[PDB]
Amino acid sequence: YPWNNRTQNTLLLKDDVGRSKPSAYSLPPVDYTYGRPLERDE
Amino acid sequence: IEQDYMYRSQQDSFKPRLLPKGNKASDLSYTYTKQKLSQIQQNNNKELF
Amino acid sequence: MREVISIHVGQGGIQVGNACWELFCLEHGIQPDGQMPSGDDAFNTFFSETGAGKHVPRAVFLDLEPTVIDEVRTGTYRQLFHPEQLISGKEDAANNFARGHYTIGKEIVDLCLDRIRKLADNCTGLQGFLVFNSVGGGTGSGLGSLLLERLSVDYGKKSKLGFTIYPSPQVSTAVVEPYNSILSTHSLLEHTDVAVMLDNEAIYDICRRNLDIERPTYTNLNRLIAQVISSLTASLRFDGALNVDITEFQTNLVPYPRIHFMLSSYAPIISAEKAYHEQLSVAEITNSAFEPANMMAKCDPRHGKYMACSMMYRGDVVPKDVNASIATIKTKRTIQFVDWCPTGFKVGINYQPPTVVPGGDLAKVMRAVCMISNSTAIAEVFSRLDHKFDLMYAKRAFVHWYVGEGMEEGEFSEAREDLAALEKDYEEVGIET
Amino acid sequence: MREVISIHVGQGGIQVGNACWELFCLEHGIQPDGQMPSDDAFNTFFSETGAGKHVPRAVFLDLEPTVIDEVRTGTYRQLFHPEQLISGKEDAANNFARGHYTIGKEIVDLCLDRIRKLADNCTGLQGFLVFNSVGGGTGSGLGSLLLERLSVDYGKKSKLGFTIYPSPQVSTAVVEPYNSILSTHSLLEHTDVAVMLDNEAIYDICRRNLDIERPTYTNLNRLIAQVISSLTASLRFDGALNVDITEFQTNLVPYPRIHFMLSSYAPIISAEKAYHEQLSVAEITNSAFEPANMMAKCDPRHGKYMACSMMYRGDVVPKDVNASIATIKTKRTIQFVDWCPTGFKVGINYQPPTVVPGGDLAKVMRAVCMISNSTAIAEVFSRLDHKFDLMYAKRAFVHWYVGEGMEEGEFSEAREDLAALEKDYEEVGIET
Amino acid sequence: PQFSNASQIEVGDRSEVNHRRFVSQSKNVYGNFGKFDPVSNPGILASKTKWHHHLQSK
Amino acid sequence: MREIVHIQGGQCGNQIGAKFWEVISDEHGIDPTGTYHGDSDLQLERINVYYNEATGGRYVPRAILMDLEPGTMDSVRAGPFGQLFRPDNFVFGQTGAGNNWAKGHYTEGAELIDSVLDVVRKEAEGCDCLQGFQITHSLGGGTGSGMGTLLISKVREEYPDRIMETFSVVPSPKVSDTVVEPYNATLSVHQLVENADECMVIDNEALYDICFRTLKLTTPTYGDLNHLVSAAMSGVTCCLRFPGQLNSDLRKLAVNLIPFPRLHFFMIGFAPLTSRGSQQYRALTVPELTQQMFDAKNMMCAADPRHGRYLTASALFRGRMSTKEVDEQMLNVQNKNSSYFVEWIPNNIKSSICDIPPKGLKMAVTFVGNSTAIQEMFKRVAEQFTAMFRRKAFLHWYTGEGMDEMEFTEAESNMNDLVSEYQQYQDATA
Amino acid sequence: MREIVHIQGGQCGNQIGAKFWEVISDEHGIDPTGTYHGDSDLQLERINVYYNEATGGRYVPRAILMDLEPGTMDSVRAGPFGQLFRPDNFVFGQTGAGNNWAKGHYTEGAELIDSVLDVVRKEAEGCDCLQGFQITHSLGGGTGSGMGTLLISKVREEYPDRIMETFSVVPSPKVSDTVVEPYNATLSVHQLVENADECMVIDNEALYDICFRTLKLTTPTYGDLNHLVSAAMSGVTCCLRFPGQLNSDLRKLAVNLIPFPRLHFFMIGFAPLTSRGSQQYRALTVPELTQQMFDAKNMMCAADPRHGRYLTASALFRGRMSTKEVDEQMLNVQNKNSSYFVEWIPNNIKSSICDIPPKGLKMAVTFVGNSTAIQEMFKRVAEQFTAMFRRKAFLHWYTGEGMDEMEFTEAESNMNDLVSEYQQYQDATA
Ligand SMILES: Nc1nc2c(ncn2[C@@H]2O[C@H](COP(=O)(O)OP(=O)(O)OP(=O)(O)O)[C@@H](O)[C@H]2O)c(=O)[nH]1
Ligand SMILES: Nc1nc2c(ncn2[C@@H]2O[C@H](COP(=O)(O)OP(=O)(O)OP(=O)(O)O)[C@@H](O)[C@H]2O)c(=O)[nH]1
Ligand SMILES: Nc1nc2c(ncn2[C@@H]2O[C@H](COP(=O)(O)OP(=O)(O)O)[C@@H](O)[C@H]2O)c(=O)[nH]1
Ligand SMILES: Nc1nc2c(ncn2[C@@H]2O[C@H](COP(=O)(O)OP(=O)(O)O)[C@@H](O)[C@H]2O)c(=O)[nH]1
Ligand SMILES: [Mg+2]
Ligand SMILES: [Mg+2]
């Protein structure tokens, strides 16, 4: 799998071009609620 | 270049099978022993003529 | 019953409007074909019911070179628009202000204003107009100026909002942009209630730093602009604790009739990687909204005082946290306001969370801030464009092609003196009593 | 409500930071991904992501990306925020001029931006930690620049300098006296308190107590991390006698100039198989003041003591503490200066030290970490002064410093600064 | 005659299998944490840590 | 809508036109029979730019072929793609030119031009919305150098507002294939300088040098050279026929390129150009595209731009790449070669992007430049002119057909002028 | 990141590079076709230091081959690993230099160097952040000894800040292949002393002694010597490409090895060197490695390092080990050989470590020592030069190509000044 710019080993090996970055760590799947919720006063 | 890399990668992805069962006298004697131990009972079952 | 008419003229205007309408249709739920998916009545700001089923956007597309018009008509949005309002010319003005303002634009502004009148007749509670064009293009500048001067006498007191992209100091595509820019600013200095600063290198640095994109194209820039516009205009179509309409923009951002040029900012702008690790609280997000690198224009606010700042919070922001954050900004010393303005902050709140296009680069965030600031430091762009104009006009380069179109020699001189008047007005306002 | 930020600069700083942070995550139970599997003390060193993991309050600065991407590819990639691992371009290559006037200014501004948008998050700043090895170019230069900037950016906020000073005779560098003296001149008046952490003393400790003939830098960093954890456990754990970071520099610093202390830790016990013992409080505190047990190669018996503060962790009893102190002050081998009738500060913490699995230390129910200000510290300054004088006698290696934006006079200023420091140390210890 | 350079010093002894060649010491010491069940027996802990150190060395 | 007609005359111009039409047909996927067998729908959206529709679905070029001899016509007719042209557009005389500018432009040209003017005005009336004209000709011959400028003037008086470009092959002393270059060349350029809107100059010596060193061809041929120049000229109208991020048509190029009315001579170039072997080891990136296109090696003329300062430069990139990377590459190169650019015009580089790369290539750039370098060619040709004119050699032939030396004197005076006020801006400072 | 570009010239440098690229490709898992076939991920993060990316994923060296005889080029291309090089990087003359330093430095070298300057500037601009240049050559030749030194002079002129290092195969008198060696060696060293930031000398006599003694191989060859030098030259850049406890790049080595700006000549060695029929036993622990280090007869130079006092030393260990044995052994060497180390620079040894051992070894080391011993080689070279120069033998060709006795007399005066000022530091006391 680890040939040149297809798969993930590290950022140097990913070596992205064009539009964006390939995701690295795990990331939440699609539509996670990022950051704190708020407005609890009970 | 791309096809050669595909071939090399798909071949490198396959290796880790050892499963040692060298078997000449070990398996010959195993067959003999299992045959004896199994067919003793089948000898002591037969309906007499 | 609130509605606004949007005009996209020029290549930059059309390309920005494409992303703008993608964002609006996705935000309101309408499919590209226009049909309602399998009422709330919140689309009246930007769409009009056809009577049964689909909806029609309140936009007019105009340009003299039909490439982008053909692209739109062959794209996935063939069914959305009104096949008659997408007016396309025959030959492009070729970055010549006189060609667009005197030669070919004259027989197109007639049908353009006819379409505007037709839309306004259907409109009932019309709030105003949005105009989208680039200043570094001759046709864009000339036809924008002609259309605005026509509207100023056809309608009069109705508000106009100008989203014009001024050239950057170092990075630019043409060779004659400054001539067009100075002529267009001469034309629009006294015709629009507001103007926004949207130079390209600022958003380039923005996307290289925060989004950390390496070679983004115009699509990302237009998407960011669309995000800004949607954040600005969500208050007219969504319920909020602090409802704000367009009338409370020039009310609070125009201290004197001449001073009406602002610069914008938006936050947060974070990919999925870095927002997974960071707080996204109101205080920090508004602190980042004011830092020297997130403005939409290349200006140094530490080189001038502030006049008026208005920001809209969109999401679930709490007014108490807003007030605490504003107090912290006041106690901050690196930011200073003009003496005759004790309070200059206009905060707005909306409950509707930000929306993200699928396949985009932005991450879904439950708080957002759109900031519009008028400050004394904006004079630097006028100074640099004036200096560049003097550099070319020293030996009258490229003048004769404008002259041969019918153009007279003196408008360069009077635009120069008008820009001098504008800069001296800014300097006189910026002084302490 | 109490937060502290640590700054790591230099290769040695990064390596020691790796060890200290793995120690903290082990101690708090945060599995290296950050997510807690299956309180509120972690707020001292970590910040909640909101739902799930935690983020350390540290920034890593280094001009050579080798250590940085080693960290980013190691097993601890999951932990840190991707944009706080700030990597420069050119390592200073043991050149103070490069790290302080040449290429450090293009990174110090971004570092200060990171500092501000980290500190604004917190509210209860007692102070900051700084890790650096003075025997290097980039670490020393960037640390000095950062301290000089922060002294005016924040002012009264506390700073803790855990510098790595050169060893008395072993060395991996050859031009390290120059950067050491320059950084000492910079740091004399820019930090609140600093510690001595020379490598030779720790080498002696690990060969003597651990009975290991194969120690490397990993053991060094693990011992230093244990020292840091013992120092900082009082901020996040209940103890019979709590102590704050602000309770340190108002007690160990008699005069503003003298703020360089030296540490010790006990009992450092190997895990071979034995029962060892129960490690009585009296005997462990006796071992703590053993001159050869000191974490720095400074002989206390050659000088006088100004102050001593020790912290016990475990199930230590104050009566045992006081009896042990009575015995130590009864002992004649160590003496105090006349104008200090008492010089002891004591801290107690209920939390026993945490043992790192796969490490060298074994689990123990008592431990003590001691930090002392003593007069005999002047010897290392004197020997480094002779070190630098032998080199500057004929202006060796001076020319590349001169040609990289450095003027020539400042060596004399550093020399006279060390002269003033040694004279102050000599005169403070004189009998009234 | 053999053409060109045709070196044969062979500085590497070769034919050894050092499968633990590219293992970084920093990572392998700082993040192994293998086995070590929560047993309170000093002898058991000592045996396990001795075996762990032997593996780290080899 | 948005179309340009093509007229070719003389041997060299006819060959340029034939190879250009073959290249365009291959690019748009049209077989020699005139039927369409392309794949992309976008390949046919603006087929009307260069072609006209006929009964049955066939496409025909809007080209006109003219000369005084039928050898070129019936040579190109039997060649590949030779049946595209409508036969009624072939106009040819029978007297020949004799490489005599006066004889071509005065004795037979006046009587012959009626048919070609009629057919070109018919095409201009028939076309939807004409923008300009394009003419391919050589300055070293008689027939081309005469009737080219003749048709230029004749088109001009009734189209003063439409734009017009001439791909003119200039003669050079290293490669001289005739003995009467200076006379006819200066006579033609005398009227080109006052009537032409754009003129791109091409040098055979430069073509030979580029195909020898960069291309590393063993046996270069006229067909190969014609293909090179055809590709270079086809690259100009990339965004005019295909969509692009930053559209820039011919009039946009004109307005961005012309600072003064009489300065409309340009040098062009194409990239990437790789040899047979090195292309295997090569990669494709915008930095190396920019480096190759800004190499004075890649220029199509013997003039060396390192000996002068650029007035205006332009680059038509084609393929899918982001705008900024290109644009700050232009910024960096302008900063690095600031002394080689005119100082009182900031940001004198034009960038345009088209989204349809050439067939077989991922991306390609066409460079156009107007710089003080071309004064060397004018000085050289003027020196040859005055050397040949001092002894009045070859002059009696011209003078025997109603010619006289006075307009020769004004032609040389105008050339000396052009040189003087073209060097004037080189040392001009703000 | 912080890559270094390779430039080699002359037959000596060409053969040196032919084996350097072999060793580097073997270390990094690259075949003759530029195809990666490694196993670990650590082989690729820093591969950009020596290689550039091409389409399809191939890595190609950033090496520039320069010479005057095409024979070396087509000999080295036909060999293995010759396809890695880009043909555009080959630059060679057609007339040769004939071991004439004057002809190579004044007549033909200046004429030819323009193209190689263009290509080296192209590479230096292409690289993201230039770290330095590294050169390999010999002073026993003419073309190398001239054009190298000229190239160093000029590239230092353009890049006065970036570090640079050169390796010099200096001639030896006992085994000498030219009577012109003193002349061109003196001229080239005079040129190099004020230009090269680092210079590292190699002696074929010492190489022969090593391969005869410690390898116990009966028949050495130039390939074998090139392999030895390539191993040493690969060892120096270990931690620059691979992680370790204490990374120490070329700039670090330069800072720590040179006391005074005019003293930048180095002698080196490698360890361990075992016999070909080495029995399988034990392992190379630190004590024997550091003893074989400081065996003075292990050095790759004919100079006897115990004849003088070491100004400084440097060790690059390769493999996984602790630093305690490192520094204690270095102090032990210091204390046992305190006579060989000058006293006013106490603790004068660089220690650096890399975690990835050489292929087929568990532990290895490269030693680079700056010692007062090289003065004898300079003394003998100067003696031979003045003996040959007193009666002006072979001088007339050197005078026939534009220069005179002034250059020779100033060069020998500078050489004597260098030797004298190098010797006063030997007997200087603290
Ligand atoms: N933000 C943004 N600006 C653009 C985009 N495309 C073009 N521009 C700007 O538009 C300016 C020039 O105008 P054009 O886009 O070419 O179109 P125009 O203003 O109508 O003028 P013409 O080209 O003659 O049609 C350039 O300086 C660009 O900065 C885009 O996609 N996004
Ligand atoms: N305690 C400890 N000190 C170390 C370690 N590694 C290096 N050092 C110290 O670091 C000093 C040399 O500096 P470097 O390790 O190169 O890092 P630096 O201080 O930033 O210097 P640079 O090379 O410029 O990066 C040595 O004198 C050591 O004392 C380590 O692992 N543990
Ligand atoms: N590229 C190219 N150039 C040509 C060709 N035929 C002639 N030429 C050029 O035209 C020049 C001679 O021009 P000439 O034939 O007298 O022009 P004419 O009188 O208009 O036909 C020579 O210098 C050639 O370089 C051709 O097929 N291809
Ligand atoms: N170690 C080594 N020395 C070499 C090699 N080739 C040539 N030499 C030495 O270089 C000297 C001759 O140099 P020369 O070929 O004239 O250099 P040039 O003129 O630049 O090609 C001889 O004394 C050889 O000892 C080689 O491959 N390895
Ligand atoms: Mg346009
Ligand atoms: Mg370092």
Coordinates of C-alpha atoms and ligand atoms in Angstrom, one line a residue, chain E residues 5, chain G residues 9-13 15-16 67 69 72 99 138 140-145 169 171 175-178 181 202 204 207 222-223 225-226 229, ligand 4:
Chain E
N5 CA 34.3 0.0 -11.3
Chain G
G9 CA 33.8 17.1 -12.6
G10 CA 36.9 15.4 -14.1
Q11 CA 37.4 11.7 -14.3
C12 CA 38.1 11.5 -10.6
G13 CA 34.9 13.2 -9.6
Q15 CA 34.1 8.0 -10.8
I16 CA 33.5 9.2 -7.2
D67 CA 34.0 17.3 -18.2
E69 CA 36.2 14.4 -22.7
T72 CA 34.1 9.6 -19.3
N99 CA 46.1 18.3 -17.7
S138 CA 41.2 15.9 -7.6
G140 CA 46.2 15.7 -9.8
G141 CA 44.3 16.5 -13.0
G142 CA 44.1 19.6 -15.1
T143 CA 40.5 20.0 -16.2
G144 CA 39.2 19.3 -12.7
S145 CA 41.8 21.4 -10.9
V169 CA 42.1 13.8 -4.1
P171 CA 48.6 14.0 -5.5
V175 CA 53.1 7.3 -6.5
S176 CA 52.7 10.2 -8.9
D177 CA 51.2 10.1 -12.4
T178 CA 52.2 13.6 -13.6
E181 CA 51.3 17.9 -10.3
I202 CA 42.1 12.0 0.5
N204 CA 45.4 7.1 -2.5
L207 CA 43.8 4.0 0.7
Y222 CA 39.9 1.8 -8.5
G223 CA 36.4 0.6 -7.9
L225 CA 38.9 2.6 -3.5
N226 CA 35.9 4.5 -4.9
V229 CA 35.6 6.9 -0.3
Ligands
LIG4 N1 40.6 7.2 -5.7 C1 40.5 7.4 -7.1 N2 41.5 8.2 -7.7 C2 41.4 8.4 -9.0 C3 40.3 7.8 -9.8 N3 40.5 8.2 -11.1 C4 41.7 8.9 -11.1 N4 42.2 9.0 -9.9 C5 43.5 9.8 -9.6 O1 43.5 11.0 -10.3 C6 44.8 11.2 -10.8 C7 44.7 11.7 -12.3 O2 43.7 12.7 -12.3 P1 43.0 13.1 -13.7 O3 42.3 12.0 -14.4 O4 44.1 13.7 -14.7 O5 42.0 14.3 -13.3 P2 41.2 15.0 -14.5 O6 42.2 15.7 -15.4 O7 40.2 16.0 -13.9 O8 40.4 14.0 -15.3 C8 45.6 9.9 -10.7 O9 46.8 10.1 -10.0 C9 44.7 9.0 -9.9 O10 45.3 8.5 -8.8 C10 39.3 7.0 -9.0 O11 38.3 6.5 -9.6 N5 39.5 6.9 -7.7

